[PDB]
Every structure is written in C-alpha cells, then in structure tokens.
Amino acid sequence: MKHSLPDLPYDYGALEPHINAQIMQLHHSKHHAAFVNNLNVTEEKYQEALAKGDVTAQIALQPALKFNGGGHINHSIFWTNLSPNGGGEPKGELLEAIKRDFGSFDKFKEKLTAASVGVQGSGWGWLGFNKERGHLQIAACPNQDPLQGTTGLIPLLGIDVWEHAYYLQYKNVRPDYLKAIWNVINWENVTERYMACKK
Amino acid sequence: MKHSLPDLPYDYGALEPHINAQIMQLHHSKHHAAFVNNLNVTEEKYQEALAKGDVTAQIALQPALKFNGGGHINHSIFWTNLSPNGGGEPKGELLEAIKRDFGSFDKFKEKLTAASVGVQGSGWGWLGFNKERGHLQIAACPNQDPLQGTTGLIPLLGIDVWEHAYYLQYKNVRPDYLKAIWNVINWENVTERYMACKK
Numbered sequence: 001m002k003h004s005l006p007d008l009p010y011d012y013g014a015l016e017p018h019i020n021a022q023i024m025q026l027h028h029s030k031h032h033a034a035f036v037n038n039l040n041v042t043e044e045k046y047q048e049a050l051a052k053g054d055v056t057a058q059i060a061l062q063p064a065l066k067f068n069g070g071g072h073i074n075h076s077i078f079w080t081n082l083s084p085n086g087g088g089e090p091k092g093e094l095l096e097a098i099k100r101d102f103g104s105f106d107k108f109k110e111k112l113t114a115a116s117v118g119v120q121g122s123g124w125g126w127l128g129f130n131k132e133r134g135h136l137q138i139a140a141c142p143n144q145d146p147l148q149g150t151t152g153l154i155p156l157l158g159i160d161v162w163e164h165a166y167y168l169q170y171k172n173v174r175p176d177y178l179k180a181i182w183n184v185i186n187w188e189n190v191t192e193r194y195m196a197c198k199k
Numbered sequence: 200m201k202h203s204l205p206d207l208p209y210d211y212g213a214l215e216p217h218i219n220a221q222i223m224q225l226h227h228s229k230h231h232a233a234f235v236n237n238l239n240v241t242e243e244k245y246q247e248a249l250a251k252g253d254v255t256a257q258i259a260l261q262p263a264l265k266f267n268g269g270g271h272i273n274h275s276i277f278w279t280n281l282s283p284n285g286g287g288e289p290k291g292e293l294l295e296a297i298k299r300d301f302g303s304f305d306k307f308k309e310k311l312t313a314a315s316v317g318v319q320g321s322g323w324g325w326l327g328f329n330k331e332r333g334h335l336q337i338a339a340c341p342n343q344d345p346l347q348g349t350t351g352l353i354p355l356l357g358i359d360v361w362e363h364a365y366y367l368q369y370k371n372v373r374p375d376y377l378k379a380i381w382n383v384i385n386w387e388n389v390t391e392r393y394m395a396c397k398k
C-alpha cells in the first residue's frame with residue numbers, strides 16, 4: 001500500500017573510486033528517502049482530492065506527484081543499474097541490439113553520454129526500449145520526470161545528471177562523472193530489463 | 200464521484216450577436232461534454248492506479264487529467280461569467296478594486312484584452328484574485344491549464360481564446376471576438392466570486 005525506500009544492494013563505498021561513498025550515502029539515504037516519504041504524502045492528498053472530486057486540488061498536486069513519484073521510480077532503477085561487478089560491455093542479445101540500433105557499443109556510449117551531458121539543469125539520460133517500434137531508443141528527461149510515465153519508453157539504463165549525483169567528487173565537470181560511471185554499469189541488470197521487454 | 204455537464208444558465212442564443220448560437224451550442228454540448236466524459240474516464244483510471252500503487256500510470260494519466268479536468272473547471276466558470284443581461288461595468292467594491300489595481304475600468308479592459316490576444320496557441324485569459332496579496336491580478340493560462348490549480352489565483356472572469364471559442368463567427372480575427380465579449384460579461388457573477396474571496 002505504501003511505497004518504500006529500497007535498500008542499496010551494495011555498500012556505500014562499493015563503487016569507489018568511480019562514485020564515492022559520501023555521494024552514495026547522501027544520494028540514497030537523504031535524496032531518495034525524501035522522495036519516497038514525500039511521494040506517500042502526495043499520494044494520500046491525491047486520494048482525498050479524488051474521492052471528493054476536487055479537480056483543482058488534483059491538478060495542484062500534479063507537480064509534487066510527478067517530482068516525488070518520478071524521483072522514487074528513477075532512483076529505484078538507478079541503484080540496480082549500478083554494481084561493483086559492473087562495467088565493461090554487455091553480451092548476448094542486448095549487445096546485438098546496441099550494435100544494430102547505434103552502430104557499435106562505443107557509438108551508443110557516445111550517444112547516451114551526449115544526451116546526459118546535454119541536460120540543461122537537472123535531469124536524466126536514458127537508454128530505453130520502444131515497445132511499438134521494437135528497438136532501443138535514447139531520451140533525456142528533465143528534473144525527476146520518469147521515462148515510461150512521460151514517454152512510454154521502457155527504462156533500461158538511467159544516468160542521473162542532477163548535480164547531487166556528482167558534484168561532491170567531480171564538481172562542475174559533469175563529463176568526468178560520465179566517464180567514470182561507465183565503469184560501474186550493471187549490464188546484468190540492464191540485460192534483464194531488456195529481455196523482459198521482448199517476449 | 201461522477202462529474203456532470205452543468206446546464207447552461209441561458210439559451211444557446213442568449214449571447215447573440217456577440218457570440219453566436221452555433222458556437223455556444225458546440226462549445227457546451229460538444230467541447231465541454233467531452234471534457235466531462237474524458238475526465239470521468241481518467242479519474243477512474245487514477246483510482247485503479249492509486250489502489251495498485253502504480254506511479255508510472257499515475258504520471259502517464261496527468262496530461263489527460265489536467266486537460267480534461269481543467270477544461271471542465273474553466274468552462275464551468277466561463278458559462279457563469281456571461282449573461283444576456285451582461286455588459287457595461289461592475290459596481291461597488293469590485294469596481295473600486297479594478298480602479299485601484301489597474302487604474303481604471305478602461306485600463307483593466309486593455310490589460311485583460313492584451314493578455315487574451317497574447318495567448319499563442321490555445322488558452323485562456325483570466326482576471327483573478329491573489330489571496331496572499333489581497334488584490335486583483337491578470338494571468339494567462341495555456342491549453343486547459345486551470346487558473347487556481349496551476350497558479351493559486353482565484354478565478355473571477357475568464358476569456359476563452361481557443362479557436363473554437365470564436366472561429367466560426369470571427370475566423371482568424373480574435374481581437375473582434377475580444378471586443379464583442381465585453382457586451383455579455385456577467386458582472387453580477389464576477390462580483391459574487393470577488394466578494395467570496397474577501398469572505
């Protein structure tokens with residue numbers, strides 16, 4: 001009934017030196033925790049407004065619902081997209097799809113990096129699956145706007161480019177963070193999400 | 200709760216020649232009716248998504264909720280803002296507030312006309328009440344985004360500047376529609392809404 005903060009699947013320092021433990025602890029225990037609690041508060045308000053047929057109240061709650069709900073959706077995926085066992089390249093059908101849709105794994109990395117570096121302000125870069133077209137697709141999302149809820153694409157790999165995802169360690173140089181994060185991508189998880197899209 | 204299309208407070212031809220009967224009938228029985236019908240469908244989908252804790256579905260439903268819910272809110276106010284007995288100027292505290300906040304009734308008309316003419320695409324011009332500042336305020340809203348739900352201002356008088364509000368009669372010449380609508384403003388209703396803010 002109530003959304004809950006998932007435990008991080010590894011130690012706060014498991015991704016060093018690529019993402020330091022201070023970032024991981026703040027990002028999970030402060031940023032994500034606030035989204036979950038605030039999401040539950042917003043949902044309860046929305047349920048009351050819906051039962052009363054208060055459309056003005058429903059609409060006034062939309063920014064908080066998308067922001068906190070998206071924050072919960074995005075970070076819950078993000079933690080599983082990273083791993084101390086990550087990095088390198090995927091294999092199997094996901095690697096084949098990457099080569100087919102983007103030319104090569106390196107070209108895909110460049111395209112997702114470009115989308116992630118190109119976010120002006122806060123947001124996310126995504127590798128997604130387009131169910132209707134049956135192929136991979138890159139998109140960027142502002143703030144906490146979640147991929148599937150706002151575009152219909154199924155999320156496979158998300159790169160958080162909010163400043164809190166990198167600033168303590170990499171300061172203003174977002175490209176240094178993007179270079180580092182490729183070393184911890186949990187391709188086992190991305191592959192699982194991809195295979196779940198195909199039937 | 201099931202939303203319902205409110206009866207129009209007058210005959211479809213009651214606002215002639217300023218807004219013709221064909222427009223009024225289409226606007227109420229087709230456009231507003233569709234907002235009500237689609238709002239009810241969207242609200243039911245939201246009830247299902249809330250019970251399942253499906254945040255992705257909640258967020259995917261937001262555009263339809265704001266569009267149809269806002270359409271229902273906006274048009275329900277709009278019908279009461281007009282009258283066959285309308286036109287002229289308000290009196291009492293509303294006229295005093297208009298003179299105080301905009302300089303004169305004529306200057307207020309210029310400002311609300313300008314905000315309404317300035318909408319690029321579909322939208323609405325509004326005279327609202329700012330509860331925190333305790334004074335009147337003009338704002339424009341895109342599409343069916345409702346005034347109170349998106350800005351907190353209490354709606355007093357709305358001018359629909361979607362093309363369906365005027366096109367059959369005035370074609371591309373939105374300024375002619377804006378000049379004509381002043382002849383049917385129900386200042387009695389605007390006054391009631393204004394006095395309800397100070398009460």
Ligand SMILES: [K+]
Binds near residue numbers: 013014016
């Ligand atoms: K360590």
Ligand SMILES: [Mn+2]
Binds near residue numbers: 027031160165
């Ligand atoms: Mn984040």
Ligand SMILES: [Mn+2]
Binds near residue numbers: 226
């Ligand atoms: Mn309309």
